[PDB]
Structure 1
Amino acid sequence: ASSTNLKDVLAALIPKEQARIKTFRQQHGGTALGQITVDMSYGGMRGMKGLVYETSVLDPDEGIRFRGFSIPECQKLLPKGGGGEPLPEGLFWLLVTGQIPTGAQVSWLSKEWAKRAALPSHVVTMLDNFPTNLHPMSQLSAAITALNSESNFARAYAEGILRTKYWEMVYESAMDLIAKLPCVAAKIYRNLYRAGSSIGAIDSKLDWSHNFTNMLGYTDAQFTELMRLYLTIHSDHEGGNVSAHTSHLVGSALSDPYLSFAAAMNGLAGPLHGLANQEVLGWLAQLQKAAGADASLRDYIWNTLNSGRVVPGYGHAVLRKTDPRYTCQREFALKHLPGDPMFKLVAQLYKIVPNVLLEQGAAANPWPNVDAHSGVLLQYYGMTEMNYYTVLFGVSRALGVLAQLIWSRALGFPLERPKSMSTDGLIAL
């Protein structure tokens, strides 16, 4: 047939990457990066360099970057569904490499996951008897913890593999995870909202995104495409966010990938971490019954900002133009769902909001994010089961919390371990 080695590649790159970091820490190593304040301790390590996360960096001028590769350059580059919208595969490839997977490097992986894609009967069991009253983000988290039984790394932990051999199996757990994530999550849904029917089979002929949607039991061809672009973009976004930080912290403790990703979700399961996409959509909804004007919404938002309220969705700390990940989904409705009452709307906010904000001193990056653009698309296709949107966002962040997990292991990074505080101490300190 055809293919590239992935693991094979990975294996080659490393000593390259492990040498650059050793020269580096070897010279400039103890060079003075920053200061800690008694305020930043109390602020959640707020603006406190402490990462070394390597897959993505926020650029105040371009948005997020999957190397130097920004939202837009991936789009036209990462290899297409064979559609318009990119494959989370090539994306996951990119992230692990620093490279743009070619045709057969991407398909390489689809066949790869196709395969890897097997769920124990004990996780099937357990998913099945979960009471509906248990949130999806809760059942997910439990499955993955239960799937941890299957971990090649735990097992080679037991058996005594060696340091340097750490990645070559945190990788193996790594691919399987991603492979059987859409089964766990397809299963959740179906069980929840599709009157617990079957999730179906797995077609090796299909690429990740599609078997998800087809396990998800949606058939709209446009549907899958959104699947493909939604998994790519929600993917990664620095190593300081709840989800990533948490895969990282638990993972540091040499905890198999599975274990660090079901904690990573207890983290995403958070309110100040999991529900944004949702918040907005609800506010829009309210907008919804509260076709109309530039004039009336400019008036309502006006009132909103003035009545001490805020618009769920716009205004980023650093960002310094449109989160392109918003643009990405907007570049889509038009393609797609162009005269959609609720999209329309969304798109109005776009016209109105930035100005009002700027004009009503609550600026310097008044442009919307992603969380403003998705929910309106999910629902359009049928995806109205909102509690569930958090799983989709966990099925996507997957690709970028694993694809570095394998590198923290690979570079051989130590136990996260920040000496802790105490208010009586600092008072003397």
Structure 2
Amino acid sequence: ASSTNLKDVLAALIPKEQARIKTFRQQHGGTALGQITVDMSYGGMRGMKGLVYETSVLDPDEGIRFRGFSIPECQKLLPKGGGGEPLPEGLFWLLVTGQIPTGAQVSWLSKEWAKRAALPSHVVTMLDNFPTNLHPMSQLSAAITALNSESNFARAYAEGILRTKYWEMVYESAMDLIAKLPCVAAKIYRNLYRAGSSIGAIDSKLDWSHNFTNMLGYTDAQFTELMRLYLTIHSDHEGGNVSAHTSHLVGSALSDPYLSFAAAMNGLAGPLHGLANQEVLGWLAQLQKAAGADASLRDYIWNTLNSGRVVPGYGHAVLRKTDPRYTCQREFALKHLPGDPMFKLVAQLYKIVPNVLLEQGAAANPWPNVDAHSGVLLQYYGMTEMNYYTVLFGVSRALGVLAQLIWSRALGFPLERPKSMSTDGLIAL
């Protein structure tokens, strides 16, 4: 008997994994997987194997994998709206469960995320009173903190449920959070950029991406496809990235999913992280102000470097090759917006930047990362408010970090609490 329910599948999956990780540890817990050096410690844990994070794994050379699925594999395997790009809904199923969903599974996520998307009056209030000089990432993160009022996990805990059931309330709060996100994000958009307008209603019959582009106010049918692609690829990027790691750290202490996502956002907002989104456009925007020569392009790049700034959109803590997400995005431009002058500048930069970065001899990875290519896409469709881009990253990111959050608590991962040391201390060691 019966029909679709991710929670029921999860209920079947949790014990098996539990069992699976216990024996493995029973035989291998003592196994040394690596060493820790002084340089690693002073270096941002660079190179340290520190966390278990199941939904995605990043390879230095190949780039990110969703099961063990690459982006190109996803592109082909996840269901589409009708009509070429993968639905983030499907990606979500995949991350959570390990399996590729059927269209029908996927339609369930949509309907479910539509049913859940409702914003409480205190939140609508705050967002409406916020200043327009308050950064959109800020506005977003405060709003999601303010939603914790509603946490099902926070309430359950308060009531004293048994640890074992944590994963269950975490999942409710995760599905609700994901549902609400686009409404908060769009209300911010509308407030800042479309004063006096309203985000409108969620239509249970559309997919999450499309409802989002509706609330944003975009009509272009290719924009909708860009959206689906965007939110899918930005999903997850293994556990060690700042945003994911922050949510993992905060969530380990038993802060509900709302609070942990919000702190995640404060991390995504950093220039070295997701704000790169925005930094790239601004830097292009300056570049153009000051159709240029490779040589003038090269002078420009030098002057950034010489000034103690970074060139945004290039480099990566783990990747050592061009980000497939970058490729992914290039391939979308080549199809749809090949004559775009901003596009052409980004294509041209790919020719120079790496070379300049190899010349300088500092960046361990001179190739571009996702952020170098994403804004150019948005701008083309009319979405030119750059300080807003990171919000969109914020939205996607929720898919991966929440999908994992549920597993963490399901597997009972404890408090993340490493040892620190001071220089004096280490000097002495």
Partner of 1:21: 21
**Relative to structure 2, which stretch is displaced further, 401-410 or 414-423?**
414-423
TM-superposition CA deviations, 1:327-369 (whole Å, max 9, x none): 1111111211111111122112234444565577668754322
Map 1:4-403; keep pairs closer than 5 Å. 4-292=4-292, 297=297, 311-316=311-316, 318-354=318-354, 365-403=365-403
What's the TM-score once normalised by structure 1's chain length?
0.93
Specify whether residues 300 and 141 from structure 1 end up closer, same or farther in structure 2 by C-alpha distance, changes over 3 A only.
closer
**Relative to structure 2, which stretch is displaced further, 104-113 or 141-150?**
141-150
Specify whether residues 172 and 427 from structure 1 end up closer, same or farther in structure 2 by C-alpha distance, changes over 3 A only.
same
Specify whether residues 256 and 213 from structure 1 end up closer, same or farther in structure 2 by C-alpha distance, changes over 3 A only.
same
The answer as to whether partners of 1:3 and 1:105 remain within 8 angstroms in 2 is no
The answer as to whether partners of 2:148 and 2:256 remain within 8 angstroms in 1 is yes
Specify whether residues 63 and 279 from structure 1 end up closer, same or farther in structure 2 by C-alpha distance, changes over 3 A only.
same
Identity level (%): 100
The answer as to whether partners of 2:282 and 2:386 remain within 8 angstroms in 1 is no
How far apart are 1:178 and its partner, in Å? Answer: 0.3
Aligned residues: 429
Specify whether residues 210 and 53 from structure 1 end up closer, same or farther in structure 2 by C-alpha distance, changes over 3 A only.
same
How far apart are 1:322 and its partner, in Å? Answer: 2.6
The answer as to whether partners of 1:190 and 1:197 remain within 8 angstroms in 2 is yes
TM-superposition CA deviations, 1:300-321 (whole Å, max 9, x none): 6588779998653334454343
The answer as to whether partners of 2:278 and 2:388 remain within 8 angstroms in 1 is no
Specify whether residues 41 and 303 from structure 1 end up closer, same or farther in structure 2 by C-alpha distance, changes over 3 A only.
closer
The answer as to whether partners of 1:117 and 1:179 remain within 8 angstroms in 2 is yes
**Relative to structure 2, which stretch is displaced further, 403-412 or 58-67?**
58-67
Distance of 1:379 and 1:357 partners within structure 2: 26
How far apart are 1:57 and its partner, in Å? Answer: 1.2
Q: Following TM superposition, where does structure 1 have runs of at least 4 consecutive aligned residues deviating by more than 6 angstroms?
A: 302-310
The answer as to whether partners of 2:315 and 2:367 remain within 8 angstroms in 1 is yes
Does the residue aligned with 1:64 lie in a helix, a strand or coil?
A: strand
**Relative to structure 2, which stretch is displaced further, 325-334 or 304-313?**
304-313
Specify whether residues 22 and 123 from structure 1 end up closer, same or farther in structure 2 by C-alpha distance, changes over 3 A only.
same
The answer as to whether partners of 1:79 and 1:86 remain within 8 angstroms in 2 is yes
TM-superposition CA deviations, 1:242-268 (whole Å, max 9, x none): 111111111111111111111111222
- Give the strand-richer structure, 1 or 2: 2
- Give the helix-richer structure, 1 or 2: 2
TM-superposition CA deviations, 1:181-218 (whole Å, max 9, x none): 00111011111111142111110011000111101111
Distance of 1:303 and 1:266 partners within structure 2: 29
TM-superposition CA deviations, 1:210-255 (whole Å, max 9, x none): 1111011111111111111110111111111111111111111111
Distance of 1:163 and 1:43 partners within structure 2: 36
**Relative to structure 2, which stretch is displaced further, 158-167 or 177-186?**
158-167
The answer as to whether partners of 1:3 and 1:104 remain within 8 angstroms in 2 is no
How far apart are 1:36 and its partner, in Å? Answer: 2.6
Specify whether residues 19 and 311 from structure 1 end up closer, same or farther in structure 2 by C-alpha distance, changes over 3 A only.
same
Specify whether residues 395 and 308 from structure 1 end up closer, same or farther in structure 2 by C-alpha distance, changes over 3 A only.
closer
The answer as to whether partners of 2:271 and 2:279 remain within 8 angstroms in 1 is no
Specify whether residues 94 and 286 from structure 1 end up closer, same or farther in structure 2 by C-alpha distance, changes over 3 A only.
same
Specify whether residues 2 and 338 from structure 1 end up closer, same or farther in structure 2 by C-alpha distance, changes over 3 A only.
farther
